[PDB]
Amino acid sequence: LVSRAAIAATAMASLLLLIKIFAWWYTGSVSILAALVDSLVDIGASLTNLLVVRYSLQPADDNHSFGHGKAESLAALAQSMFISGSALFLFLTGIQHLISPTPMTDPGVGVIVTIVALICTIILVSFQRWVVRRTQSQAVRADMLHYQSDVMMNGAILLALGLSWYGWHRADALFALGIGIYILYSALRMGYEAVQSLLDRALPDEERQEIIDIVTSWPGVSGAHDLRTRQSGPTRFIQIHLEMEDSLPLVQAHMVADQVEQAILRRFPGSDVIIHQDPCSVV
Amino acid sequence: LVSRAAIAATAMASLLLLIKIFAWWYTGSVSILAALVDSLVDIGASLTNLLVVRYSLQPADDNHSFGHGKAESLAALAQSMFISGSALFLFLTGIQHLISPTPMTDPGVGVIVTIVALICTIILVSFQRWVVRRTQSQAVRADMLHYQSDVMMNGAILLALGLSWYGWHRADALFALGIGIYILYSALRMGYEAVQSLLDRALPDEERQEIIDIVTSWPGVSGAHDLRTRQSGPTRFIQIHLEMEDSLPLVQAHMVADQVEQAILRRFPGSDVIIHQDPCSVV
Ligand SMILES: [Hg+2]
Ligand SMILES: [Hg+2]
Ligand SMILES: [Hg+2]
Ligand SMILES: [Hg+2]
Ligand SMILES: [Zn+2]
Ligand SMILES: [Zn+2]
Ligand SMILES: [Zn+2]
Ligand SMILES: [Zn+2]
Ligand SMILES: [Zn+2]
Ligand SMILES: [Zn+2]
Ligand SMILES: [Zn+2]
Ligand SMILES: [Zn+2]
C-alpha cells in the first residue's frame, strides 16, 4: 500500500505516450496521417493534468486553508468538456459519412502505427484503471476517459468481409457513430460529477449513515444535530453538533467530543472533522 | 435596501435584450447583418445564466448541506471561458484585417441598429454595474463582462476623417485589436477569480483580521487557534477553535462561544460560523 502519490504516478504514465509521439514516423517512412497531432495534443493536455494534480496534492496553504483538492474536480470538468466535444464531433462525423461522401479511408497505409497505438494505449488505460480503483481520483478518471476513446481505435475494420455486398452498405459509420454516443454520455456524466463536487455536495448516504451511527452510539453524547459533509478531492470534511450534558466541565465535554472526532477519523482516514459541542438548549 | 434577489433582477435585465432581438429587422427592411445572432446567442446564454443564479439562490438542500452558492462561480467560470474565446477570436481578427485583405465594412447599411444597440446595451451594463456594486455577484459580473464587449460597438468609425490619407493607413484594426487584448485580459482575470472561489480560497486578509480581532478581544476566550475561511457565492464560512478555561461548565463555555459566534455573525451578515471549543491542551 502506497499513498495518493499513486495518482502522481499515472500522470507521467500519460506522458508514456511521449514515446508514442516518437512511435510516429516521417524520417523512418515519409508518410503522414492525423493521429500524430491527437497524440501531440495528448502530451500537452495530460502534461497540464500532471501539473494540476501536483497542485491538487499540496497541503493547507495560507489562502487555501481547506484543501487544494478541488483542483482535481476542476481538472476533471475541464477534460469532460473537451472530451464531450470530441465525442459530439465524432457522432456528427458518424452520421456525416454514413456513406454521404463514401468510405474513403481505403489506403492500406502502414497500419503498424494504429495497432501499436492500441497496444500501448491499452497498457496505459489499465494502469489508469488500476489507480482509479485504488484511489477514487476524479482527475485521473477524466484523463483516462480520453484514452478510453483512443483505445476505440479501428484496425478492427473488416477487410476480408470488408464493407458488405452492395445493397446493404457498411463502413466506419456504425462504429464511429456508436463510440460517439457512448463517450459523449460517458464524458457528460463524468463532468456532472465534477460540478457536483464543485458545488459542495454531501457524502454518499452510506458514509453519512456510518458517521451518524459512530456518533449516536458513543457513550458521552446524548444527541447530535447538525451534520454537514462534503469532500474536496480525497479528503472529506465533516462537521457536527454533539449534545453533551449541560453541567459537564469543558475539559470533560471536550474529551467525549475528541473521542467521537477520533472515531470518525479512523473510519474515514484522511478526513477532517470539527465538532461543535452544545449542552441542552435544543427541542 | 432590497435583498440578494437584486441579482435575480439583473438576470431578466439581460433578457431585456429580448427586445433587441426584435429591434432587428427583416420584414421592416429586407437586409441582414451578423449582430442578430450574437444577440440570439445572448438570449440563450444569459437565460441559462438566469436559471443558474436561481439555482444558486436555493437554501440548504438534502445533498447540498452547505450552499448552492458555488453555482455562481461555475456560471462565472463558464462565461469567462466563452468570453475569453470571443476575445482571442477578435484579437486575431485584429491582426487579420490589419488591412491584409482591406477595410471591407464600407456598406453604409442602416446603422440605426448599432446605435440603438449601443443605447440599450449601455442601459443594461449600468444596471448590471449597479448590482455588481450592491452585491458582489461573481455570476452577474461575468454576464456583464460580455455586454461590456457588446458596448465596444463601433458606430464610432470615422467617416469624415475616415481611414487616413494614404501612406499611414487606418481601419477597425486599431480598435478591434485593442478591445481584444483588454477583454481577453479582463475575462482571464475574471475566470481566475472564479476557479479561485471554486478552490476553497480564504477570505481577504481584511475580513480575516476582523474575525481575529472580534475573537481575541472577547471576555471569555483566552486563545483561539484554528481559523479557516471561505465563501461560496454570497455566504461566507468560518470556523475556529476557542480556548476557554479548562474547568468551565459546558453551558457556560457554550455561552462565551455563542456570543463570539453571534458577534462574527453581526459583522458579516449572511455568514455561517462554527466554533469548536478547546480547554487548555495546546502549547
Ligand atoms: Hg508502449
Ligand atoms: Hg443531556
Ligand atoms: Hg432598450
Ligand atoms: Hg485557560
Ligand atoms: Zn488521443
Ligand atoms: Zn494554496
Ligand atoms: Zn447546535
Ligand atoms: Zn451551539
Ligand atoms: Zn452579444
Ligand atoms: Zn441541492
Ligand atoms: Zn483545537
Ligand atoms: Zn479539540
Curated annotation (Swiss-Prot), chains A, B:
GO cellular component assignments: plasma membrane
Membrane topology: Multi-pass membrane protein
Effect of residue 38 to H: Loss of cadmium ion transmembrane transporter activity. No effect on zinc ion transmembrane transporter activity
Lineage top rank: taxon: Bacteria
An annotated GO BP: intracellular zinc ion homeostasis
Residues on Periplasmic side: 24-34, 97-110, 152-171
Binding site for Zn(2+) 4: 254, 276, 278
Gene Ontology MF term list: cadmium ion transmembrane transporter activity; ferrous iron transmembrane transporter activity; identical protein binding; metal ion binding; zinc efflux antiporter activity; zinc:proton antiporter activity
Residues bound to Cd(2+): 38, 42, 146, 150
Positions contributing to Zn(2+) 3 binding: 225, 241, 278
Residues that hold Zn(2+) 2 according to the record: 61, 64, 68
Induction profile: Induced by iron and zinc.
Cytoplasmic domain ranges by topology: 52-74, 130-140, 192-283
TM ranges: 10-23, 35-51, 75-96, 111-129, 141-151, 172-191
Stretch forming the signal peptide: none
Documented activity regulation: Cytoplasmic zinc binding may trigger movements of two electrically repulsive cytoplasmic domains and reorient transmembrane helices, thereby modulating coordination geometry of the active site for zinc transport. It may modulate activity in response to cytoplasmic metal fluctuations.
Reactions mediated catalytically: Zn(2+)(in) + H(+)(out) = Zn(2+)(out) + H(+)(in); Cd(2+)(in) + H(+)(out) = Cd(2+)(out) + H(+)(in); Fe(2+)(in) + H(+)(out) = Fe(2+)(out) + H(+)(in)
NCBIfam families cross-referenced by the UniProt entry: CDF, PRK09509.1
Entry's family note: Belongs to the cation diffusion facilitator (CDF) transporter (TC 2.A.4) family. FieF subfamily.
Complex formation: Homodimer. The subunits are held together in a parallel orientation through zinc binding at the interface of the cytoplasmic domains.
Function: Divalent metal cation transporter which exports Zn(2+), Cd(2+) and possibly Fe(2+). May be involved in zinc and iron detoxification by efflux. In vitro, can also bind, but probably not transport, Hg(2+), Co(2+), Ni(2+), Mn(2+), Ca(2+) and Mg(2+).
Protein name in the entry: Cation-efflux pump FieF
Organism: Escherichia coli (strain K12)
